[PDB]
């Protein structure tokens, strides 16, 4: 109902068992939607989209990630 709580994947727009390349593969469609010059609006969410594709872009952050992530 106000599902705020939730993990990068379900932020980035890609099911919570995305591949890192369905990450990296929707995070370019996303810009492409989000980005300032072409969404005024939406400028500040640009901002999670990479806070989320940081840590499922290396694979010692991924590796902590998947099993504790406050890491």
């Known amino acids: 109902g106000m599902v705020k709580e939730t993990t990068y ?3 980035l727009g890609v099911k919570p068992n995305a591949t890192q390349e369905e990450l990296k593969k929707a995070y370019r ?3 492409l939607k989000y980005h300032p010059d ?26 902590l ?4 992530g406050e890491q």
């Open 9 to 11: 994947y379900d932020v």
């Open 29 to 31: 469609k996303l810009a």
């Open 38 to 63: 072409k969404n005024p609006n939406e400028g500040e969410k640009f901002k999670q989209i990479s806070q989320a594709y940081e840590v499922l872009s290396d694979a010692k952050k991924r590796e």
């Open 65 to 68: 990630y998947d099993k504790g």
